[PDB]
Design an enzyme around this catalytic site. Structure first.
Site, PDB file in Angstrom:
ATOM      1  N   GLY A 130      76.224  53.459 108.770  1.00 48.65           N
ATOM      2  CA  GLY A 130      75.371  53.708 107.623  1.00 48.65           C
ATOM      3  C   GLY A 130      74.162  54.556 107.959  1.00 48.65           C
ATOM      4  O   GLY A 130      73.346  54.864 107.089  1.00 48.65           O
ATOM      5  N   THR A 139      71.383  49.160 105.463  1.00 47.94           N
ATOM      6  CA  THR A 139      72.032  50.000 106.463  1.00 47.94           C
ATOM      7  C   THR A 139      72.963  49.178 107.348  1.00 47.94           C
ATOM      8  O   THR A 139      72.792  47.967 107.492  1.00 47.94           O
ATOM      9  CB  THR A 139      70.999  50.718 107.351  1.00 47.94           C
ATOM     10  N   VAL A 140      73.956  49.847 107.935  1.00 47.66           N
ATOM     11  CA  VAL A 140      74.903  49.218 108.844  1.00 47.66           C
ATOM     12  C   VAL A 140      75.074  50.124 110.055  1.00 47.66           C
ATOM     13  O   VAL A 140      74.772  51.318 110.014  1.00 47.66           O
ATOM     14  CB  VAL A 140      76.270  48.948 108.174  1.00 47.66           C
ATOM     15  N   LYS A 159      73.825  44.984 110.639  1.00 45.39           N
ATOM     16  CA  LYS A 159      73.573  45.226 109.217  1.00 45.39           C
ATOM     17  C   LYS A 159      72.110  45.628 109.028  1.00 45.39           C
ATOM     18  O   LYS A 159      71.274  44.877 108.522  1.00 45.39           O
ATOM     19  CB  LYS A 159      73.932  43.993 108.397  1.00 45.39           C
ATOM     20  N   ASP A 193      81.456  40.023  93.553  1.00 39.57           N
ATOM     21  CA  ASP A 193      81.298  41.390  94.031  1.00 39.57           C
ATOM     22  C   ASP A 193      82.345  42.303  93.405  1.00 39.57           C
ATOM     23  O   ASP A 193      83.084  41.891  92.513  1.00 39.57           O
ATOM     24  CB  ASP A 193      81.402  41.439  95.555  1.00 39.57           C
TER      25      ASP A 193
HETATM   26  N1  LIG Z   1      82.035  43.802 112.100  1.00 38.64           N
HETATM   27  C1  LIG Z   1      82.608  44.991 111.894  1.00 38.64           C
HETATM   28  N2  LIG Z   1      83.688  45.325 112.632  1.00 38.64           N
HETATM   29  C2  LIG Z   1      84.264  46.513 112.429  1.00 38.64           C
HETATM   30  N3  LIG Z   1      83.923  47.474 111.567  1.00 38.64           N
HETATM   31  C3  LIG Z   1      82.851  47.116 110.851  1.00 38.64           C
HETATM   32  C4  LIG Z   1      82.148  45.925 110.945  1.00 38.64           C
HETATM   33  N4  LIG Z   1      81.095  45.905 110.046  1.00 38.64           N
HETATM   34  C5  LIG Z   1      81.180  47.062 109.438  1.00 38.64           C
HETATM   35  N5  LIG Z   1      82.216  47.847 109.874  1.00 38.64           N
HETATM   36  C6  LIG Z   1      82.578  49.178 109.399  1.00 38.64           C
HETATM   37  O1  LIG Z   1      81.416  49.800 108.878  1.00 38.64           O
HETATM   38  C7  LIG Z   1      81.671  50.271 107.540  1.00 38.64           C
HETATM   39  C8  LIG Z   1      80.396  50.226 106.735  1.00 38.64           C
HETATM   40  O2  LIG Z   1      80.729  50.146 105.333  1.00 38.64           O
HETATM   41  P1  LIG Z   1      80.544  48.799 104.521  1.00 38.64           P
HETATM   42  O3  LIG Z   1      79.409  48.053 105.115  1.00 38.64           O
HETATM   43  O4  LIG Z   1      81.846  47.994 104.475  1.00 38.64           O
HETATM   44  O5  LIG Z   1      80.237  49.232 103.022  1.00 38.64           O
HETATM   45  P2  LIG Z   1      78.963  50.108 102.667  1.00 38.64           P
HETATM   46  O6  LIG Z   1      79.168  51.468 103.340  1.00 38.64           O
HETATM   47  O7  LIG Z   1      77.723  49.425 103.102  1.00 38.64           O
HETATM   48  O8  LIG Z   1      78.916  50.405 101.108  1.00 38.64           O
HETATM   49  P3  LIG Z   1      78.989  49.250 100.062  1.00 38.64           P
HETATM   50  O9  LIG Z   1      78.800  49.846  98.635  1.00 38.64           O
HETATM   51  O10 LIG Z   1      77.859  48.213 100.334  1.00 38.64           O
HETATM   52  S1  LIG Z   1      80.723  48.366 100.165  1.00 38.64           S
HETATM   53  C9  LIG Z   1      82.794  49.379 107.031  1.00 38.64           C
HETATM   54  O11 LIG Z   1      83.521  50.014 105.986  1.00 38.64           O
HETATM   55  C10 LIG Z   1      83.639  49.174 108.290  1.00 38.64           C
HETATM   56  O12 LIG Z   1      84.575  50.228 108.489  1.00 38.64           O
END
Ligand SMILES: Nc1ncnc2c1ncn2[C@@H]1O[C@H](COP(=O)(O)OP(=O)(O)OP(O)(O)=S)[C@@H](O)[C@H]1O
Lengths: 219, 171, 224
Positions: free
Chosen positions: B14, B15-16, B28, B100
């Site tokens: 991404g 935040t992630v 996250k 959701d």
């Molecule tokens: N614990 C994890 N293990 C592996 N891949 C992960 C993990 N957490 C996140 N990801 C990856 O990181 C991506 C980040 O996107 P998400 O967090 O799922 O959705 P987003 O981009 O935040 O948007 P939205 O609208 O909130 S669903 C995910 O789609 C996964 O591919």
């Protein structure tokens, strides 16, 4: 193209003896195996030697661990030679067709490289099978067999062409195992792995470069 | 040997983002809303589904979670569709309303107002996955147009499918 | 004597069974009683020498069906199948000849008699799967007869949870659905057989389970 189709079929059934046996025939015609019949003869004899080499690696191991029994070791040795004889018999059957039919008819750089490399391996299998003075003569036959291939393809084929790596992979495997000289082994692979990376078919190439990489970290 | 052939914070999304706390993990990475979603999301635990591996507050508030490597729902049949219904059903049972996301770990374990709100969206997700038994289609239509424990039973009936026989083993 | 068993083991570690079968039938000609595990050697030695030919036969035939849109290939694919047919027929007739001639007649122990008779019924079934004309029908009965004789003997003296009796009922059932196409009789035999074991199910329990799971998994296949 009946023999090729029959061989294609004997591959699907996994009857490898018939693979080679009907493949021998098209080689015996004096024709130059195509890029396909090359591979079909390649897998045909590879599976026939993989089996016996795989049986030999087992029986040889037993013969080592049977220090206890006296007559039992006799049979274990007796069977081993029976496999080696089966192993040698198939090898002589492939080298002979090589020298008589394939290499003489060879015209392309890949053709010569493939068949000498095929000649090289079928002398490396014999080397392990060989026990004493035969090892010297056969390995000496082995070294020449590969070397002609290697000097052909150092300049007469692109740096990334798969056989160039295929020649690099096995020539080296002959270098380390049979000659017991890792120095030449790693030198050949490293040169071979290096020249491709600079020159970096792609999916085909990377399939064996991993084995080139693992060899380098092996010896 | 082998011969030729035949024939800490790490990566970011991404935040992630990725992480390394006690092994590779997901971080996250507004603040008041971020904390609120953290509180609701952090409830999940004590199951094979919705597992975490840590947490963070400063210098950047975030949550450390266990990683997953597999063909996620979008990234990628019934073997997981049971898991998704069960996991959401179990979490719904513990009174967490989501209203959701599904990621495969080991390529086998798929990891994830009122309960029915989550039911409505799950029917859509299931439909896309399937596009086969007719019971699967009927269940998806019913959800879009029941109680999740009823949906899990619906999958059980869908588990009827289980070629060629098999004789005594060759030994 | 004891040397032949050693060579057969030496051919099941090299994973070359054509010699294991060949050495085993040589032990068979002695006419004596195969020991508890010498008999098992014979079964696996022959069980693998056949299984290799059957699957080879399976793909080749499947290609023959898939290759219905040609002539020369089907002729050769049919011709190659006839080659795998003939090879398999020889192996079949080799095992059966030993069973009826040396093994079954000397099958003094009940466990042995059911084992061989099932094996005779078994290796008859392999013959039926490939046989097409009236030969299949002749083989169908002899599979049935031999299956049945073991089936009866197992009930009289043998427990209902023994691996052989379970393997016998799993195999017999495969004959019903595949060779005969009577899934009603298949599931009745399979269901009854494992049902009885479950009643008396309680190392000994493990082996029966592996067949039983095969029994139950077969049932789910046939039901739907
Ligand atoms: N614990 C994890 N293990 C592996 N891949 C992960 C993990 N957490 C996140 N990801 C990856 O990181 C991506 C980040 O996107 P998400 O967090 O799922 O959705 P987003 O981009 O935040 O948007 P939205 O609208 O909130 S669903 C995910 O789609 C996964 O591919």
């Amino acid at each position: 193209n009946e023999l090729v189709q029959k061989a294609k079929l004997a591959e699907q059934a996994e009857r490898y003896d018939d693979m080679a046996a009907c493949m021998k025939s098209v080689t015996e015609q004096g024709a130059e195996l195509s890029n396909e019949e090359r591979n079909l003869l390649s897998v045909a004899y590879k599976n026939v030697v993989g089996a016996r080499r795989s049986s030999w690696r087992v029986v040889s191991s037993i013969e080592q661990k049977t220090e206890g029994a006296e007559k039992k070791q006799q049979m274990a040795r007796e069977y081993r030679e029976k496999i080696e004889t089966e192993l040698r018999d198939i090898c002589n059957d492939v080298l002979s067709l090589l020298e008589k039919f394939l290499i003489p008819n060879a015209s392309q750089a890949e053709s010569k490289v493939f068949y000498l490399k095929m000649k090289g391996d079928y002398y490396r299998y014999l080397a392990e099978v060989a026990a004493g003075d035969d090892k010297k003569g056969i390995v000496d036959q082995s070294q020449q067999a590969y070397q002609e291939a290697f000097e052909i393809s150092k300049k007469e084929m692109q740096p990334t062409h798969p056989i160039r790596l295929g020649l690099a992979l096995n020539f080296s495997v002959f270098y380390y195992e049979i000659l017991n000289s890792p120095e030449k082994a790693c030198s050949l692979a490293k040169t071979a792995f290096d020249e491709a990376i600079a020159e970096l078919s792609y999916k085909d190439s990377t399939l064996i470069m991993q084995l080139l990489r693992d060899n380098l970290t092996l010896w | 040997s082998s011969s030729a052939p035949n024939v800490t914070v790490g990566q970011r999304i991404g935040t992630v983002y990725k992480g390394k706390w006690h092994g590779d993990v997901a971080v996250k990475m507004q603040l008041q809303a971020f904390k609120n979603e953290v509180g609701v999301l952090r409830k999940t635990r004590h199951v094979n589904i919705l597992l975490f591996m840590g947490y963070s507050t400063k210098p950047q508030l975030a949550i450390v979670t266990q990683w997953c490597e597999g063909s996620s729902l979008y990234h990628h049949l019934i073997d997981i569709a049971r898991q998704t219904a069960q996991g959401m059903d179990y979490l719904h049972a513990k009174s967490i309303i989501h209203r959701d996301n599904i990621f495969l770990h080991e390529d086998l374990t798929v990891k994830i107002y009122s309960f029915q709100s989550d039911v409505y969206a799950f029917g859509i997700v299931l439909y896309e996955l399937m596009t086969c038994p007719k019971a699967m289609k009927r269940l998806m239509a019913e959800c879009l147009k029941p109680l999740f424990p009823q949906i899990l039973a619906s999958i059980e009936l869908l588990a009827r499918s289980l070629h060629r026989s098999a004789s005594e083993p060759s030994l």
